[PDB]
Amino acid sequence: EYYEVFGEFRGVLMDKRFTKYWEDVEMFLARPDDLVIATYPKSGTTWISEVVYMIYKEKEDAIFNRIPYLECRNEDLINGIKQLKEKESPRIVKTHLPPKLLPASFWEKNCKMIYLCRNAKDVAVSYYYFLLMITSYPNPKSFSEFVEKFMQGQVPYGSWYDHVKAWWEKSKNSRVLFMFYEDMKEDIRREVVKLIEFLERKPSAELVDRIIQHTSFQEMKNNPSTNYTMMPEEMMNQKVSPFMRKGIIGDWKNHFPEALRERFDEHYKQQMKDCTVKFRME
Amino acid sequence: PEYYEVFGEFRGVLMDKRFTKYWEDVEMFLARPDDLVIATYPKSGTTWISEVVYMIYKEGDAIFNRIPYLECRNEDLINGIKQLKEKESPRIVKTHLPPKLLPASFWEKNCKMIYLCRNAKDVAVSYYYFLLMITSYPNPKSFSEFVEKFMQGQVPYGSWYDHVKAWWEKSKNSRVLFMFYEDMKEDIRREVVKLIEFLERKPSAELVDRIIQHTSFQEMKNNPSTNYTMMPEEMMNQKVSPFMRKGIIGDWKNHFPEALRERFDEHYKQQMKDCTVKFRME
Numbered sequence: 001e002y003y004e005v006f007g008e009f010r011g012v013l014m015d016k017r018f019t020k021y022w023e024d025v026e027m028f029l030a031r032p033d034d035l036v037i038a039t040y041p042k043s044g045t046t047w048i049s050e051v052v053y054m055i056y057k058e059k060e061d062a063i064f065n066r067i068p069y070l071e072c073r074n075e076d077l078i079n080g081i082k083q084l085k086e087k088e089s090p091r092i093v094k095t096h097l098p099p100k101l102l103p104a105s106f107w108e109k110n111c112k113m114i115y116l117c118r119n120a121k122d123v124a125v126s127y128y129y130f131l132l133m134i135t136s137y138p139n140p141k142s143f144s145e146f147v148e149k150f151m152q153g154q155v156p157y158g159s160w161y162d163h164v165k166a167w168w169e170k171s172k173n174s175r176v177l178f179m180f181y182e183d184m185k186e187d188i189r190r191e192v193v194k195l196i197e198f199l200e201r202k203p204s205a206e207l208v209d210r211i212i213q214h215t216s217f218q219e220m221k222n223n224p225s226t227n228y229t230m231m232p233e234e235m236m237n238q239k240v241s242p243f244m245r246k247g248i249i250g251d252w253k254n255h256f257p258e259a260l261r262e263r264f265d266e267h268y269k270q271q272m273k274d275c276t277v278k279f280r281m282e
Numbered sequence: 283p284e285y286y287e288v289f290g291e292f293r294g295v296l297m298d299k300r301f302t303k304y305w306e307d308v309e310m311f312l313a314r315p316d317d318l319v320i321a322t323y324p325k326s327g328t329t330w331i332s333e334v335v336y337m338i339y340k341e342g343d344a345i346f347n348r349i350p351y352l353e354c355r356n357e358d359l360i361n362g363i364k365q366l367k368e369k370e371s372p373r374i375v376k377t378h379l380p381p382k383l384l385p386a387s388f389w390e391k392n393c394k395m396i397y398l399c400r401n402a403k404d405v406a407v408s409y410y411y412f413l414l415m416i417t418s419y420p421n422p423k424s425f426s427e428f429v430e431k432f433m434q435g436q437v438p439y440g441s442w443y444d445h446v447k448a449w450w451e452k453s454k455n456s457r458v459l460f461m462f463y464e465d466m467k468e469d470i471r472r473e474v475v476k477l478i479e480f481l482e483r484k485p486s487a488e489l490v491d492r493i494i495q496h497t498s499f500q501e502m503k504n505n506p507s508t509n510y511t512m513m514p515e516e517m518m519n520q521k522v523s524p525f526m527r528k529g530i531i532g533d534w535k536n537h538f539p540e541a542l543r544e545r546f547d548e549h550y551k552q553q554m555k556d557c558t559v560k561f562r563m564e
């Protein structure tokens with residue numbers, strides 16, 4: 001059941017398994033040099049995670065082991081916090097939490113953070129398939145039904161709108177880098193150099209080019225460490241939908257009927273009205 | 283997936299292909315002098331004796347974390363070897379491997395070991411439900427169909443007969459304790475004192491009493507650490523059949539039709555003809 005699996009937690013619909021032991025996330029102890037990589041689900045977290053990991057590093061363990069998913073928790077089988085506690089510094093932390101739910105210690109230690117977003121319509125499409133692929137998540141009755149929920153913020157991790165706005169505001173901090181999926185798509189070289197500098201490293205052709213080559217869609221698909229094939233089918237059924245699905249901009253055009261798009265875009269307007277964030281023109 | 287797509291014959295032993303894909307990790311496993319191996323044929327009471335032994339170690343977390351399942355492996359999500367490599371000594375190792383497949387390092391380091399067996403007919407019954415509960419294991423068409431496979435050793439971990447016989451011979455070693463599920467059922471205090479001494483500890487009446495009270499079936503069935511409820515339903519569906527199912531002797535009488543029992547028992551006699559193992563009369 002949808003609401004048997006998901007429950008509102010502090011104003012944010014969440015996977016009850018991630019909030020059962022919330023005290024572990026709340027009291028999580030951050031380290032000065034921890035780097036937080038935050039995104040709303042399906043905005044390209046895997047992509048920027050690999051880029052950042054490559055920068056740090058100047059049969060490879062799954063990305064979910066290399067970069068622990070902070071709040072991910074499934075009783076005693078899966079525990080991101082446990083992984084992070086045993087991870088040697090500098091730790092790279094992945095999260096989908098809105099600023100209000102992120103462990104306060106990260107803000108307190110003034111940790112560098114990288115927030116990545118993607119245009120809402122394309123997020124909704126990728127998110128829709130994500131729900132299909134996750135065996136324990138009830139499959140939406142249809143894309144439209146799912147979009148209605150997406151607009152209401154009635155999906156895991158809540159409102160995409162509140163998520164982006166809050167993080168955008170947090171990005172006022174020079175230690176919180178705000179990025180766009182579409183910018184990495186339309187101008188990767190620049191975004192990579194930007195990241196390398198934000199992380200205080202010397203950008204060289206060798207480094208930038210190795211990263212660009214290694215992080216292309218085709219390359220990350222085909223990479224077992226990043227395509228999530230190292231993750232049990234009983235959990236993530238990629239037969240339903242692969243993780244590295246399309247990796248393009250504008251897939252919403254193949255899913256949003258005319259009516260829904262106009263309704264979605266109108267709603268978007270109302271939501272992001274007073275938000276100065278600059279998404280790339282399509 | 284078909285039965286033989288999931289299971290494959292490995293060095294004469296039908297195995298879960300996921301446990302043999304990276305066999306080199308098991309084969310080259312490095313044992314430590316003080317490692318204690320707890321070996322059993324699936325569904326013979328491994329959880330029971332594991333908890334008893336653990337309690338002895340702590341002088342009165344999920345058990346699969348406290349006592350790593352050596353060869354268990356599911357790509358990068360589950361890895362017993364990885365767990366053991368990070369486990370501080372003295373390590374307690376769980377395994378269902380026949381002596382010929384057990385990492386040679388254990389024999390080389392002459393590690394103490396505890397082998398536990400259960401009467402074949404009751405093992406087959408418990409094993410049958412185990413197959414039903416494991417989501418990724420094809421459910422037998424019927425108990426009979428499953429028993430035919432069991433007699434042929436065409437089930438994960440192979441022939442129960444070869445398993446018991448080989449380990450029985452290995453038990454000649456004073457450092458390899460051979461025990462029976464039915465003995466723990468009919469006389470736990472003795473079996474507990476026996477274990478406490480094998481592990482070189484003092485069998486106080488208080489300690490023995492603690493263990494007996496804590497390792498009863500009714501207790502472990504309600505202990506989340508041992509009833510495997512700390513393990514995702516997507517993997518182990520206890521709704522199909524609970525782990526702590528019955529915990530009795532003779533459940534075969536409720537499953538083996540007359541014909542099958544006579545056929546099974548006849549086969550058993552030819553398989554075990556020259557085995558001096560003393561199974562408890564029931």
Ligand SMILES: Nc1ncnc2c1ncn2[C@@H]1O[C@H](COP(=O)(O)O)[C@@H](OP(=O)(O)O)[C@H]1O
Pocket residue numbers: 039040041042043044045046047122125126127129215216217220243244245246247248251
């Ligand atoms: N190197 C890359 N280039 C382009 N898109 C990528 C990518 N790596 C991951 N993605 C895309 O990011 C989405 C997964 O999101 P996340 O990593 O946040 O969970 C998928 O979107 P699509 O479903 O639209 O294809 C996936 O294809």
Ligand SMILES: Nc1ncnc2c1ncn2[C@@H]1O[C@H](COP(=O)(O)O)[C@@H](OP(=O)(O)O)[C@H]1O
Pocket residue numbers: 322323324325326327328329330404407408409411497498499500502525526527528529530533
């Ligand atoms: N404390 C206990 N007392 C009696 N039986 C126990 C027990 N703990 C586990 N078992 C039994 O051991 C079997 C599980 O085997 P294993 O632990 O090796 O996988 C189950 O058998 P049944 O299916 O007959 O009920 C289970 O109920």
Ligand code: VO4
Pocket residue numbers: 040041042043045046130
């Ligand atoms: O948004 V994702 O990186 O958990 O699939």
Ligand code: VO4
Pocket residue numbers: 323324325326327328329412
């Ligand atoms: O035989 V068991 O202890 O892996 O289920």
